[PDB]
Swiss-Prot record:
Location in the cell: Cell membrane; Presynaptic cell membrane; Cytoplasmic vesicle, Secretory vesicle, Synaptic vesicle membrane; Lysosome membrane
Gene Ontology terms, MF aspect: calcium ion binding; calcium ion sensor activity; calcium-dependent phospholipid binding; calmodulin binding; clathrin binding; phosphatidylinositol-4,5-bisphosphate binding; phosphatidylserine binding; SNARE binding
Domain notes: The C2 domains bind Ca(2+) and membranes. Binding to membranes involves Ca(2+)-dependent phospholipid binding. Compared to other members of the family, the C2 domains of SYT7 dock and insert into cellular membranes in response to intracellular Ca(2+) concentrations that are lower than those required for other synaptotagmins. The two C2 domains bind independently to planar membranes, without interdomain cooperativity. Moreover, SYT7 C2 domains insert more deeply into membranes compared to other synaptotagmins.
Post-translational modification as stated in the protein's UniProt record: Palmitoylated at its vesicular N-terminus; palmitoylation is required for localization to lysosome and phagocytosis in macrophages.
Residues binding Ca(2+) 3, per UniProt: 103, 106, 109
Tissue: Expressed in the brain (at protein level).
Role this protein plays: Ca(2+) sensor involved in Ca(2+)-dependent exocytosis of secretory and synaptic vesicles through Ca(2+) and phospholipid binding to the C2 domain. Ca(2+) induces binding of the C2-domains to phospholipid membranes and to assembled SNARE-complexes; both actions contribute to triggering exocytosis. SYT7 binds Ca(2+) with high affinity and slow kinetics compared to other synaptotagmins. Involved in Ca(2+)-triggered lysosomal exocytosis, a major component of the plasma membrane repair.
Main localization category: membrane
Subunit structure: Homodimer. Can also form heterodimers with SYT6, SYT9 and SYT10. Interacts with calmodulin (CALM1, CALM2 or CALM3). Interacts with CD63; required for localization to lysosomes. Interacts with APP.
Keyword Transmembrane helix appears in the UniProt entry: yes
Cellular component terms per the entry's GO annotation: axon; axon terminus; cytosol; dendrite; dense core granule; early phagosome; GABA-ergic synapse; glutamatergic synapse
Identification of the protein by name: Synaptotagmin-7
Length: 138
């Protein structure tokens, strides 16, 4: 009855991204900028990170960044557009980012996740955020 949770945060790195809405175009922009201090998820001692972008509760339709080979501090600087997306639907979504290590001979390795409800963002301007990656394990 004091707070939701308290505890140690696993050091999974952090990610920077921006989001904003253009009302004339009815377009939501999400820019996945860069990540820092990602863990190594390959026996080579690096990872091959990419980001999956969801607008929850839509768990089916996602976008993805490119894979940055052997890079624990990737700079994607990739811009994604959700064009002709009505504003009244936008504010009902949660922007969800999942960072993974791309693998060749096994399944990709999830690293961590972040999210932000778009109804808590002032989308009239591009807003930029840093968030520490949280565990995305089941
Ligand atoms: Ca791996
Ligand atoms: Ca890998
Ligand atoms: Ca793997």
């Amino acid at each position: 009855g004091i707070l939701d949770s308290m505890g140690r945060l696993e050091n999974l790195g952090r990610i920077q991204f921006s989001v904003g809405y253009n009302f004339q175009e009815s377009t939501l922009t999400v820019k996945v900028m860069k990540a820092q201090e990602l863990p190594a998820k390959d026996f080579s001692g690096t990872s091959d990170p990419f980001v999956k972008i969801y607008l929850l509760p839509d768990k089916k339709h996602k976008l993805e960044t490119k894979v940055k080979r052997k890079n624990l501090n990737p700079h994607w600087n990739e811009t994604f557009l959700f064009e002709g997306f009505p504003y009244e639907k936008v504010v009902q979504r949660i922007l969800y980012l999942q960072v993974l290590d791309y693998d060749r001979f096994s399944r990709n390795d999830p690293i961590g996740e972040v999210s932000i409800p778009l109804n808590k963002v002032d989308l009239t301007q591009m807003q930029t955020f840093w968030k520490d990656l949280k565990p995305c394990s089941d």
